[model samples]
Target: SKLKLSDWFNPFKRPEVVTMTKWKAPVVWEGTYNRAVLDNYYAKQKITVGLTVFAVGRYIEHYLEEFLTSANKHFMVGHPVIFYIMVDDVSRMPLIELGPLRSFKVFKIKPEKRWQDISMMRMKTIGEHIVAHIQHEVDFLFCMDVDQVFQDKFGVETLGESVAQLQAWWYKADPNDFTYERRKESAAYIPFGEGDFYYHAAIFGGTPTQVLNITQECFKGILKDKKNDIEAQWHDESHLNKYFLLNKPTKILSPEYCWDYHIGLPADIKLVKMSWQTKEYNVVRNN
Candidate 1:
């Protein structure tokens, strides 16, 4: 609220675009909202936002340092933030000073055999931690992939009952061509001609209770697929899309919120709040 609405930006500066979802959720883009307005509102409540990131095995040394430093500089600025980091080896975790009003806890998690399994297991671990303490510790929470770094201010405009991130690469593609799980046997199946935006599993958020439900359901679907000896093509990501198919999100984030530099820049992107790091597939998911 500190910034004058009129002085924030010329209302006519940005070109026209789709800013709302068919399901009634607003897609957040930089020029579309004023952080000064939202910052004023959340500052009153003195709310604390929780962030969870997993840094297991190779990820601990590869991306943790940059991720934490960038997040401390950008995420939910001026608000108390708690980082609930899960890692396989505490010794290798990044050491960063988050300055005032921010703190972190490093939780030990078991390493998975394959990188795919590591991704799928996050649902179970997140649900467990939410039950144990995260519920009472913060008013809202977000789970993010460590391979991403903050590129701009990622503040209060993102808070909502449930938030889904639209994948940068597939955002403009047709739904029928999405990479959703197609096998009828897997629990994450979604038949052709039926789909919404291809949500990126890299980032998702909501109230603690809502997040718990999201993770629990996704993990349950994973377990069922395991017993049937069939894994969804995208594993946890496939199941996450399935969950959103039925329970609509209260808000959605545009590609500007989590863009990929490798995909090249588009003019429509007003600002890139976060960007993806180069990933390696040769390294096995092992301790």
Candidate 2:
């Protein structure tokens, strides 16, 4: 519960399509765990998973439709799911048909002028929902970026106490080169030589309580940075990297969980569950 990066000081490890975190958390990679077995295990409890996504401004028009349609076909298929979609304009919310055992909970979130505030504030809105009711609705929860499309089965094998996605581009990037906010003035700042893996802000989750802690904590830093008249090198993502160093997500998903195809295919990436959609700022964001 400190406002500094050195609080937990739990420096950690990665590489070669890793399978395990040194702290005993599994670094989930394809074929590392059997999906059928995980399904059966969770089935005994009949766990319901929750997914939260934000589609605001032009994003609602450009990407939200394909995102949900694809999610219905692949995301946690056969398991009960609650899609918590927060949008700037509810009237434009896509009325896509979902598969059996799935439902949606729509929320109206106010938009920010710049993409920076829009993303940084995602933490605040998520906390508001969890405390309101999400904590009781599902056994596990995942928050994703709306621009990515689901391409393969993203089943129960990925669940854990707290889940973190390795940024596809930074999976093998050296720690020193990681884009942590180096400035000491911002609460999201992390000093040199004290990093874990560079995590993607696109998809992250856990149990409701854990996810609440994550979103709440990240937002706190975000607020602190705003007050100091500074912003992190990578916005909320910079704060997220800072959180991982201390809390250490209970499970880590490989780049496959959130890949960007622009980088092209590689042998190690056997399955790409979801990939990025290009940002059409000219058409979608500007007048």
Candidate whose TM-score is highest: 1
**Tens digits of per-residue lDDT for model 1 on 31-80?**
87777867877888888999999989888889999999999999998999
Worst 10 residues of 1 by lDDT: 278-287
Best candidate (score: lDDT) = 1
Per-model TM-score, in order, reads: 0.92, 0.91
- Candidate 2 C-alpha lDDT tens digits along 99-159: 8989998989889999988888899999999999999899999998899899999988778
How many steric clashes between backbone atoms does each model show?
A: 1, 0
The Cα error of candidate 1 at residue 154, in Å, is 0.4
Query: Which segments of candidate 2 are over 4 A away from where they belong?
Result: 1-16, 280-287
